[PDB]
PDB file of C-alpha atoms in Angstrom:
ATOM      1  CA  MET A   1       0.000   0.000   0.000  1.00 13.25           C
ATOM      2  CA  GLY A   2       0.606   3.604  -0.532  1.00 14.72           C
ATOM      3  CA  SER A   3       2.821   6.599  -0.705  1.00 12.21           C
ATOM      4  CA  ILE A   4       6.383   7.792  -1.284  1.00 11.28           C
ATOM      5  CA  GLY A   5       8.524   9.581   1.290  1.00  9.56           C
ATOM      6  CA  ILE A   6      11.118  11.988  -0.164  1.00 10.81           C
ATOM      7  CA  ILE A   7      14.508  12.650   1.442  1.00 10.05           C
ATOM      8  CA  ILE A   8      16.456  15.660   0.098  1.00  9.83           C
ATOM      9  CA  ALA A   9      20.163  15.157   0.939  1.00 10.02           C
ATOM     10  CA  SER A  10      23.321  17.224   0.489  1.00 11.44           C
ATOM     11  CA  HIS A  11      26.673  18.423   1.632  1.00 13.07           C
ATOM     12  CA  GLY A  12      25.892  21.639   3.533  1.00 12.02           C
ATOM     13  CA  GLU A  13      22.611  23.558   3.601  1.00 10.70           C
ATOM     14  CA  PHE A  14      21.849  22.994  -0.121  1.00 12.63           C
ATOM     15  CA  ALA A  15      19.046  20.494   0.680  1.00 11.00           C
ATOM     16  CA  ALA A  16      17.348  22.901   3.109  1.00 10.22           C
ATOM     17  CA  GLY A  17      17.602  25.834   0.689  1.00  6.98           C
ATOM     18  CA  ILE A  18      16.148  23.974  -2.290  1.00  6.12           C
ATOM     19  CA  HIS A  19      13.415  22.634  -0.013  1.00  4.99           C
ATOM     20  CA  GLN A  20      12.540  26.333   0.464  1.00  4.51           C
ATOM     21  CA  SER A  21      12.669  26.934  -3.322  1.00  4.90           C
ATOM     22  CA  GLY A  22      10.177  24.100  -3.695  1.00  4.96           C
ATOM     23  CA  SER A  23       7.800  25.448  -1.074  1.00  4.56           C
ATOM     24  CA  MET A  24       7.738  28.863  -2.804  1.00  4.11           C
ATOM     25  CA  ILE A  25       7.132  27.445  -6.311  1.00  6.25           C
ATOM     26  CA  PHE A  26       5.018  24.398  -5.396  1.00  5.97           C
ATOM     27  CA  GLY A  27       3.730  25.076  -1.866  1.00  7.86           C
ATOM     28  CA  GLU A  28       3.958  23.006   1.302  1.00  6.56           C
ATOM     29  CA  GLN A  29       4.350  19.215   0.982  1.00  4.08           C
ATOM     30  CA  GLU A  30       3.882  16.199   3.291  1.00  4.93           C
ATOM     31  CA  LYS A  31       6.386  13.377   3.822  1.00  4.64           C
ATOM     32  CA  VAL A  32       9.477  15.350   2.877  1.00  3.16           C
ATOM     33  CA  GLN A  33      12.615  15.051   5.025  1.00  2.00           C
ATOM     34  CA  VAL A  34      15.781  17.194   4.730  1.00  2.00           C
ATOM     35  CA  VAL A  35      19.221  15.700   5.526  1.00  2.00           C
ATOM     36  CA  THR A  36      22.131  18.143   5.623  1.00  2.00           C
ATOM     37  CA  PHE A  37      25.770  17.186   6.226  1.00  2.00           C
ATOM     38  CA  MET A  38      27.606  19.947   8.063  1.00  2.00           C
ATOM     39  CA  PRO A  39      31.332  20.498   8.667  1.00  2.00           C
ATOM     40  CA  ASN A  40      31.235  19.517  12.371  1.00  2.00           C
ATOM     41  CA  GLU A  41      29.778  16.065  11.479  1.00  2.00           C
ATOM     42  CA  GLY A  42      30.956  12.581  10.619  1.00  2.00           C
ATOM     43  CA  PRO A  43      29.546   9.606   8.702  1.00  2.00           C
ATOM     44  CA  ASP A  44      27.872   8.102  11.739  1.00  2.00           C
ATOM     45  CA  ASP A  45      25.987  11.316  12.517  1.00  2.00           C
ATOM     46  CA  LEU A  46      24.766  11.182   8.912  1.00  2.00           C
ATOM     47  CA  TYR A  47      23.794   7.498   9.174  1.00  2.00           C
ATOM     48  CA  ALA A  48      21.608   8.447  12.161  1.00  2.00           C
ATOM     49  CA  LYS A  49      19.939  11.301  10.264  1.00  2.00           C
ATOM     50  CA  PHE A  50      19.011   8.956   7.409  1.00  2.00           C
ATOM     51  CA  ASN A  51      17.575   6.272   9.705  1.00  2.00           C
ATOM     52  CA  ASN A  52      15.631   8.968  11.555  1.00  2.00           C
ATOM     53  CA  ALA A  53      14.304  10.350   8.238  1.00  2.00           C
ATOM     54  CA  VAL A  54      13.118   6.916   7.052  1.00  2.00           C
ATOM     55  CA  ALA A  55      11.435   6.243  10.429  1.00  2.00           C
ATOM     56  CA  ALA A  56       9.413   9.476  10.039  1.00  2.00           C
ATOM     57  CA  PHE A  57       7.500   7.907   7.140  1.00  2.00           C
ATOM     58  CA  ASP A  58       4.905   5.176   7.519  1.00  2.00           C
ATOM     59  CA  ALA A  59       6.254   1.633   7.402  1.00  2.00           C
ATOM     60  CA  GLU A  60       4.488   0.975   4.083  1.00  2.00           C
ATOM     61  CA  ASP A  61       5.877   4.054   2.255  1.00  2.00           C
ATOM     62  CA  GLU A  62       8.530   3.618  -0.447  1.00  2.00           C
ATOM     63  CA  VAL A  63      11.537   5.964  -0.230  1.00  2.00           C
ATOM     64  CA  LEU A  64      12.969   8.383  -2.827  1.00  2.00           C
ATOM     65  CA  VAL A  65      16.326  10.000  -2.042  1.00  2.00           C
ATOM     66  CA  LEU A  66      17.227  13.051  -4.126  1.00  2.00           C
ATOM     67  CA  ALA A  67      20.955  13.550  -3.512  1.00  2.00           C
ATOM     68  CA  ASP A  68      23.366  16.320  -4.468  1.00  2.00           C
ATOM     69  CA  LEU A  69      26.098  14.137  -6.024  1.00  2.00           C
ATOM     70  CA  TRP A  70      27.158  10.533  -6.746  1.00  2.00           C
ATOM     71  CA  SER A  71      30.069  10.800  -4.288  1.00  2.00           C
ATOM     72  CA  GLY A  72      30.743  11.677  -0.656  1.00  2.00           C
ATOM     73  CA  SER A  73      29.171  10.833   2.658  1.00  2.00           C
ATOM     74  CA  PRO A  74      25.518  11.868   1.969  1.00  2.00           C
ATOM     75  CA  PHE A  75      25.301   9.534  -1.061  1.00  2.00           C
ATOM     76  CA  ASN A  76      27.330   6.732   0.581  1.00  2.00           C
ATOM     77  CA  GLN A  77      25.206   6.691   3.760  1.00  2.00           C
ATOM     78  CA  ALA A  78      21.954   6.844   1.766  1.00  2.00           C
ATOM     79  CA  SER A  79      23.166   3.804  -0.213  1.00  2.00           C
ATOM     80  CA  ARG A  80      24.090   2.035   3.032  1.00  2.00           C
ATOM     81  CA  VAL A  81      20.650   2.636   4.578  1.00  2.00           C
ATOM     82  CA  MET A  82      19.032   1.473   1.301  1.00  2.00           C
ATOM     83  CA  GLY A  83      21.053  -1.753   1.382  1.00  2.00           C
ATOM     84  CA  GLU A  84      20.273  -2.383   5.046  1.00  2.00           C
ATOM     85  CA  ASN A  85      16.485  -2.286   4.358  1.00  2.00           C
ATOM     86  CA  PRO A  86      15.950  -4.729   1.468  1.00  2.00           C
ATOM     87  CA  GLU A  87      12.271  -5.265   2.396  1.00  2.00           C
ATOM     88  CA  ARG A  88      11.600  -1.608   1.487  1.00  2.00           C
ATOM     89  CA  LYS A  89      11.599  -0.207  -2.047  1.00  2.00           C
ATOM     90  CA  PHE A  90      14.195   2.582  -2.479  1.00  2.00           C
ATOM     91  CA  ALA A  91      15.479   4.757  -5.282  1.00  2.00           C
ATOM     92  CA  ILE A  92      18.352   7.255  -5.133  1.00  2.00           C
ATOM     93  CA  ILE A  93      18.674   9.972  -7.806  1.00  2.00           C
ATOM     94  CA  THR A  94      21.847  12.100  -7.918  1.00  2.00           C
ATOM     95  CA  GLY A  95      22.353  15.550  -9.391  1.00  2.00           C
ATOM     96  CA  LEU A  96      19.538  17.236  -7.398  1.00  2.00           C
ATOM     97  CA  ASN A  97      18.126  20.347  -9.102  1.00  2.00           C
ATOM     98  CA  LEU A  98      14.865  22.291  -8.933  1.00  2.00           C
ATOM     99  CA  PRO A  99      13.257  20.705 -12.031  1.00  2.00           C
ATOM    100  CA  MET A 100      13.952  17.321 -10.382  1.00  2.00           C
ATOM    101  CA  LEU A 101      12.211  18.351  -7.170  1.00  2.00           C
ATOM    102  CA  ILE A 102       9.195  19.831  -8.988  1.00  2.00           C
ATOM    103  CA  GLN A 103       8.850  16.656 -11.054  1.00  2.00           C
ATOM    104  CA  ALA A 104       9.179  14.475  -7.956  1.00  2.00           C
ATOM    105  CA  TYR A 105       6.294  16.308  -6.272  1.00  2.00           C
ATOM    106  CA  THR A 106       4.219  16.032  -9.480  1.00  2.00           C
ATOM    107  CA  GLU A 107       4.932  12.297  -9.969  1.00  2.00           C
ATOM    108  CA  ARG A 108       3.799  11.701  -6.384  1.00  2.00           C
ATOM    109  CA  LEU A 109       0.495  13.493  -7.032  1.00  2.00           C
ATOM    110  CA  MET A 110       0.039  11.710 -10.363  1.00  2.00           C
ATOM    111  CA  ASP A 111       1.211   8.168  -9.862  1.00  2.00           C
ATOM    112  CA  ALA A 112       2.583   7.465  -6.353  1.00  2.00           C
ATOM    113  CA  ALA A 113       0.942   4.022  -6.249  1.00  2.75           C
ATOM    114  CA  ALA A 114       3.137   2.826  -9.172  1.00  2.23           C
ATOM    115  CA  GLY A 115       6.216   2.813  -6.900  1.00  2.00           C
ATOM    116  CA  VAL A 116       9.489   4.743  -6.667  1.00  2.00           C
ATOM    117  CA  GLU A 117      11.136   2.581  -9.319  1.00  2.00           C
ATOM    118  CA  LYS A 118       8.478   3.459 -11.900  1.00  2.00           C
ATOM    119  CA  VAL A 119       8.314   7.206 -11.230  1.00  2.00           C
ATOM    120  CA  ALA A 120      12.102   7.668 -11.227  1.00  2.00           C
ATOM    121  CA  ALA A 121      12.536   7.502 -15.017  1.00  2.00           C
ATOM    122  CA  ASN A 122      10.522  10.646 -15.705  1.00  2.00           C
ATOM    123  CA  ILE A 123      11.956  12.511 -12.711  1.00  2.00           C
ATOM    124  CA  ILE A 124      15.392  11.894 -14.277  1.00  2.00           C
ATOM    125  CA  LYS A 125      14.242  13.060 -17.717  1.00  2.00           C
ATOM    126  CA  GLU A 126      12.778  16.352 -16.517  1.00  2.00           C
ATOM    127  CA  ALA A 127      15.794  17.054 -14.297  1.00  2.00           C
ATOM    128  CA  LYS A 128      18.067  16.729 -17.347  1.00  2.36           C
ATOM    129  CA  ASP A 129      15.683  18.519 -19.739  1.00  3.91           C
ATOM    130  CA  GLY A 130      15.591  21.517 -17.405  1.00  3.03           C
ATOM    131  CA  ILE A 131      19.317  22.174 -17.975  1.00  5.56           C
ATOM    132  CA  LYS A 132      19.186  24.730 -20.816  1.00  6.62           C
ATOM    133  CA  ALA A 133      21.299  27.717 -21.869  1.00  7.50           C
ATOM    134  CA  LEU A 134      20.958  31.262 -23.089  1.00  7.82           C
ATOM    135  CA  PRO A 135      21.984  32.182 -25.740  1.00 12.95           C
ATOM    136  CA  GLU A 136      20.249  29.295 -27.465  1.00  9.30           C
ATOM    137  CA  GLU A 137      23.217  28.355 -29.642  1.00 12.43           C
ATOM    138  CA  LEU A 138      25.121  27.161 -26.534  1.00 12.98           C
ATOM    139  CA  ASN A 139      22.823  24.126 -26.215  1.00  9.77           C
ATOM    140  CA  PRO A 140      23.884  20.676 -27.570  1.00 11.47           C
TER     141      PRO A 140
ATOM    142  CA  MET B   1      43.113  39.726 -19.185  1.00 11.74           C
ATOM    143  CA  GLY B   2      39.592  38.839 -18.076  1.00  9.52           C
ATOM    144  CA  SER B   3      38.337  35.646 -16.415  1.00  7.01           C
ATOM    145  CA  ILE B   4      34.844  34.267 -15.637  1.00  5.65           C
ATOM    146  CA  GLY B   5      32.802  35.639 -12.740  1.00  2.55           C
ATOM    147  CA  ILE B   6      30.080  33.180 -11.599  1.00  6.80           C
ATOM    148  CA  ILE B   7      26.655  34.242 -10.282  1.00  9.31           C
ATOM    149  CA  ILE B   8      24.659  31.510  -8.503  1.00 13.55           C
ATOM    150  CA  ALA B   9      20.959  32.491  -8.577  1.00 14.74           C
ATOM    151  CA  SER B  10      17.800  30.975  -7.105  1.00 14.43           C
ATOM    152  CA  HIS B  11      14.410  31.328  -5.543  1.00 15.28           C
ATOM    153  CA  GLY B  12      15.013  31.257  -1.813  1.00 14.81           C
ATOM    154  CA  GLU B  13      18.222  30.177  -0.109  1.00 16.24           C
ATOM    155  CA  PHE B  14      19.067  27.323  -2.560  1.00 16.98           C
ATOM    156  CA  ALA B  15      21.885  29.414  -4.108  1.00 16.68           C
ATOM    157  CA  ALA B  16      23.558  30.155  -0.756  1.00 18.22           C
ATOM    158  CA  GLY B  17      23.274  26.529   0.321  1.00 15.69           C
ATOM    159  CA  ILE B  18      24.863  25.043  -2.808  1.00 14.39           C
ATOM    160  CA  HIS B  19      27.579  27.671  -2.575  1.00 13.11           C
ATOM    161  CA  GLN B  20      28.342  26.118   0.825  1.00 12.66           C
ATOM    162  CA  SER B  21      28.310  22.613  -0.699  1.00 13.80           C
ATOM    163  CA  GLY B  22      30.851  23.834  -3.238  1.00 13.10           C
ATOM    164  CA  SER B  23      33.143  25.262  -0.563  1.00  9.59           C
ATOM    165  CA  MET B  24      33.144  21.911   1.333  1.00 10.83           C
ATOM    166  CA  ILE B  25      34.349  20.087  -1.812  1.00  9.76           C
ATOM    167  CA  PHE B  26      36.292  22.730  -3.800  1.00 10.43           C
ATOM    168  CA  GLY B  27      37.603  25.193  -1.248  1.00 12.06           C
ATOM    169  CA  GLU B  28      37.312  28.959  -1.516  1.00 12.43           C
ATOM    170  CA  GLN B  29      36.516  30.207  -5.025  1.00 17.11           C
ATOM    171  CA  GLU B  30      37.229  33.752  -6.200  1.00 16.83           C
ATOM    172  CA  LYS B  31      34.744  35.834  -8.240  1.00 16.23           C
ATOM    173  CA  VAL B  32      31.584  33.979  -7.173  1.00 13.82           C
ATOM    174  CA  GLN B  33      28.453  35.978  -6.225  1.00 11.02           C
ATOM    175  CA  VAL B  34      25.242  34.612  -4.666  1.00 11.96           C
ATOM    176  CA  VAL B  35      21.802  36.010  -5.627  1.00  7.47           C
ATOM    177  CA  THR B  36      18.797  34.784  -3.643  1.00  5.44           C
ATOM    178  CA  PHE B  37      15.177  35.794  -4.256  1.00  9.56           C
ATOM    179  CA  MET B  38      13.260  35.629  -0.997  1.00 10.43           C
ATOM    180  CA  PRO B  39       9.482  35.462  -0.331  1.00 14.91           C
ATOM    181  CA  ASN B  40       9.411  39.163   0.686  1.00 16.11           C
ATOM    182  CA  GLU B  41      11.177  40.672  -2.351  1.00 15.50           C
ATOM    183  CA  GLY B  42      10.133  41.851  -5.792  1.00 11.31           C
ATOM    184  CA  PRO B  43      11.634  41.980  -9.299  1.00 13.84           C
ATOM    185  CA  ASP B  44      13.227  45.408  -8.841  1.00 11.19           C
ATOM    186  CA  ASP B  45      15.042  44.235  -5.704  1.00 13.47           C
ATOM    187  CA  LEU B  46      16.239  41.234  -7.719  1.00 12.27           C
ATOM    188  CA  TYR B  47      17.401  43.364 -10.662  1.00 11.26           C
ATOM    189  CA  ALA B  48      19.513  45.407  -8.232  1.00 10.54           C
ATOM    190  CA  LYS B  49      21.092  42.262  -6.765  1.00  9.71           C
ATOM    191  CA  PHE B  50      22.176  41.190 -10.275  1.00  9.41           C
ATOM    192  CA  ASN B  51      23.608  44.616 -11.098  1.00  9.91           C
ATOM    193  CA  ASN B  52      25.512  44.677  -7.799  1.00  4.34           C
ATOM    194  CA  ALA B  53      26.826  41.147  -8.353  1.00  4.11           C
ATOM    195  CA  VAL B  54      28.101  42.076 -11.828  1.00  7.20           C
ATOM    196  CA  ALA B  55      29.745  45.202 -10.367  1.00  6.39           C
ATOM    197  CA  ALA B  56      31.767  43.018  -7.984  1.00  9.58           C
ATOM    198  CA  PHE B  57      33.721  41.636 -10.961  1.00 10.80           C
ATOM    199  CA  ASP B  58      36.299  43.460 -13.066  1.00  7.07           C
ATOM    200  CA  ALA B  59      35.201  45.345 -16.162  1.00  4.98           C
ATOM    201  CA  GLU B  60      36.870  42.869 -18.503  1.00  5.54           C
ATOM    202  CA  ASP B  61      35.421  39.763 -16.804  1.00  7.45           C
ATOM    203  CA  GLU B  62      32.809  37.590 -18.515  1.00  8.87           C
ATOM    204  CA  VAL B  63      29.676  36.586 -16.562  1.00 10.46           C
ATOM    205  CA  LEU B  64      28.292  33.036 -16.171  1.00  7.59           C
ATOM    206  CA  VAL B  65      24.911  32.835 -14.410  1.00  5.98           C
ATOM    207  CA  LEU B  66      23.952  29.429 -13.004  1.00  6.39           C
ATOM    208  CA  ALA B  67      20.214  29.697 -12.329  1.00  5.02           C
ATOM    209  CA  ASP B  68      17.736  27.391 -10.627  1.00  6.73           C
ATOM    210  CA  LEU B  69      14.926  27.322 -13.237  1.00 10.65           C
ATOM    211  CA  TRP B  70      14.272  28.230 -16.867  1.00  7.08           C
ATOM    212  CA  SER B  71      11.889  31.219 -17.255  1.00  5.17           C
ATOM    213  CA  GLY B  72      11.816  31.816 -13.482  1.00  2.28           C
ATOM    214  CA  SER B  73      12.194  35.346 -12.088  1.00  2.36           C
ATOM    215  CA  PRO B  74      15.928  34.881 -11.301  1.00  4.14           C
ATOM    216  CA  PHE B  75      16.397  33.736 -14.902  1.00  5.52           C
ATOM    217  CA  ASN B  76      14.268  36.590 -16.277  1.00  5.53           C
ATOM    218  CA  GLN B  77      16.140  39.342 -14.452  1.00  8.54           C
ATOM    219  CA  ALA B  78      19.462  37.741 -15.435  1.00 10.48           C
ATOM    220  CA  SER B  79      18.333  37.804 -19.071  1.00 15.07           C
ATOM    221  CA  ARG B  80      17.398  41.462 -18.703  1.00 14.54           C
ATOM    222  CA  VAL B  81      20.799  42.407 -17.271  1.00 14.74           C
ATOM    223  CA  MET B  82      22.477  40.412 -20.046  1.00 13.69           C
ATOM    224  CA  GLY B  83      20.581  42.399 -22.684  1.00 13.95           C
ATOM    225  CA  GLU B  84      21.381  45.708 -20.983  1.00 13.19           C
ATOM    226  CA  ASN B  85      25.171  44.992 -20.943  1.00 11.01           C
ATOM    227  CA  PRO B  86      25.771  44.021 -24.574  1.00  9.47           C
ATOM    228  CA  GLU B  87      29.497  44.910 -24.404  1.00  6.65           C
ATOM    229  CA  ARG B  88      29.959  42.069 -21.833  1.00 10.63           C
ATOM    230  CA  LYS B  89      30.090  38.381 -22.708  1.00  8.09           C
ATOM    231  CA  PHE B  90      27.283  36.611 -20.803  1.00  9.90           C
ATOM    232  CA  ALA B  91      25.865  33.102 -20.564  1.00 11.18           C
ATOM    233  CA  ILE B  92      22.975  31.671 -18.525  1.00 11.25           C
ATOM    234  CA  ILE B  93      22.602  27.974 -17.686  1.00 13.23           C
ATOM    235  CA  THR B  94      19.474  26.778 -15.849  1.00 13.08           C
ATOM    236  CA  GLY B  95      18.832  23.588 -13.905  1.00 13.01           C
ATOM    237  CA  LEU B  96      21.582  24.489 -11.384  1.00 13.95           C
ATOM    238  CA  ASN B  97      23.019  21.373  -9.653  1.00 13.71           C
ATOM    239  CA  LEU B  98      26.253  20.524  -7.846  1.00 13.69           C
ATOM    240  CA  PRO B  99      27.886  18.725 -10.827  1.00 14.20           C
ATOM    241  CA  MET B 100      27.264  21.921 -12.829  1.00 15.40           C
ATOM    242  CA  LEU B 101      28.959  24.105 -10.232  1.00 16.31           C
ATOM    243  CA  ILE B 102      31.925  21.721  -9.803  1.00 15.90           C
ATOM    244  CA  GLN B 103      32.543  21.684 -13.542  1.00 13.62           C
ATOM    245  CA  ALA B 104      32.295  25.477 -13.756  1.00 13.72           C
ATOM    246  CA  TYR B 105      34.992  25.765 -11.066  1.00 13.48           C
ATOM    247  CA  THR B 106      37.144  23.171 -12.899  1.00 11.37           C
ATOM    248  CA  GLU B 107      36.812  25.013 -16.218  1.00 13.46           C
ATOM    249  CA  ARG B 108      38.192  28.252 -14.775  1.00 11.82           C
ATOM    250  CA  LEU B 109      41.193  26.459 -13.220  1.00 12.71           C
ATOM    251  CA  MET B 110      42.116  24.670 -16.469  1.00 12.63           C
ATOM    252  CA  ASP B 111      42.017  27.699 -18.783  1.00  8.07           C
ATOM    253  CA  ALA B 112      41.381  31.268 -17.610  1.00  8.56           C
ATOM    254  CA  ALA B 113      41.314  32.386 -21.260  1.00  8.03           C
ATOM    255  CA  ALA B 114      38.281  30.245 -22.147  1.00  3.12           C
ATOM    256  CA  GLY B 115      35.205  32.435 -22.350  1.00  2.95           C
ATOM    257  CA  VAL B 116      31.673  31.642 -21.171  1.00  2.34           C
ATOM    258  CA  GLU B 117      30.666  30.664 -24.715  1.00  2.00           C
ATOM    259  CA  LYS B 118      33.487  28.130 -24.892  1.00  2.34           C
ATOM    260  CA  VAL B 119      33.091  26.486 -21.453  1.00  2.00           C
ATOM    261  CA  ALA B 120      29.277  26.183 -21.504  1.00  2.00           C
ATOM    262  CA  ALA B 121      29.073  22.921 -23.455  1.00  2.00           C
ATOM    263  CA  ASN B 122      31.155  20.860 -21.048  1.00  2.00           C
ATOM    264  CA  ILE B 123      29.441  22.451 -18.008  1.00  2.00           C
ATOM    265  CA  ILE B 124      26.024  21.471 -19.445  1.00  2.00           C
ATOM    266  CA  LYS B 125      27.302  17.973 -20.295  1.00  2.00           C
ATOM    267  CA  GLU B 126      28.593  17.243 -16.800  1.00  2.00           C
ATOM    268  CA  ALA B 127      25.457  18.763 -15.184  1.00  2.00           C
ATOM    269  CA  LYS B 128      23.275  16.321 -17.126  1.00  2.00           C
ATOM    270  CA  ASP B 129      25.646  13.314 -16.855  1.00  2.00           C
ATOM    271  CA  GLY B 130      25.698  13.752 -13.067  1.00  2.00           C
ATOM    272  CA  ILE B 131      22.008  12.883 -12.881  1.00  2.00           C
ATOM    273  CA  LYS B 132      21.926   9.088 -12.362  1.00  2.00           C
ATOM    274  CA  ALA B 133      20.001   6.567 -10.260  1.00  2.00           C
ATOM    275  CA  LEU B 134      20.264   3.555  -8.017  1.00  2.00           C
ATOM    276  CA  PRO B 135      19.245   0.817  -8.667  1.00  2.00           C
ATOM    277  CA  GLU B 136      21.413   0.942 -11.769  1.00  2.00           C
ATOM    278  CA  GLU B 137      18.700  -0.598 -13.963  1.00  2.00           C
ATOM    279  CA  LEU B 138      17.133   2.891 -14.113  1.00  2.00           C
ATOM    280  CA  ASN B 139      20.243   4.132 -15.990  1.00  2.00           C
ATOM    281  CA  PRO B 140      20.896   3.884 -19.771  1.00  2.00           C
TER     282      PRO B 140
END
């Protein structure tokens, strides 16, 4: 049964700031957790934050992690928590940007019961498609 | 000679937060300005922030704006400033993410003579390529 909990994760306050961007553009949202990794912190503090974020969702919810980068402690600890909970469906998407977050909120509204693995493909596509340049000739 | 000044621009505190992410991974970076657009500000406030950010660079510097969202207010006021300073080389890339910012920093280190029109293609490429998922079956 059910829903998708979203965890926004980053080095530094990035994840908190883009969570604000999203609430201005999209409005308030349920079942969103923010995990920041600050300079006075180590990997085990981050491990605790992820476990605490997952426990804030209902036991039936699938989990979508939107992470800053495919490297470093935020990504590594998200992957660890994913691998320690094989009875729970997880997806991690790296390269967090605002089109990605908007599309994640929309896919939840539209199609949350299809699962995190189904909705990820179009979240990825819109995140990439929203990277565009001016002047137009600079685009691939 | 001139080099590239970077403006990181967003709705809300996103831009300040990812600037912090960048400093945790890439140290202190010269000629980087942050432009945030907060819930209690309007377009004329924003326009002034962009003009002040551009004034922090040297007259011969080129300007690279990394913006959160295509056709958003940060993007629109950046485009306006670009059109008002036609004697300055300018580029705008939307879909701001941490791979994008990392590559922009790398480009300036490798070749301070490369202008914003030359470095844009690899910055866009790495910004898109950095968007990937686990499980890996969601990837191409």
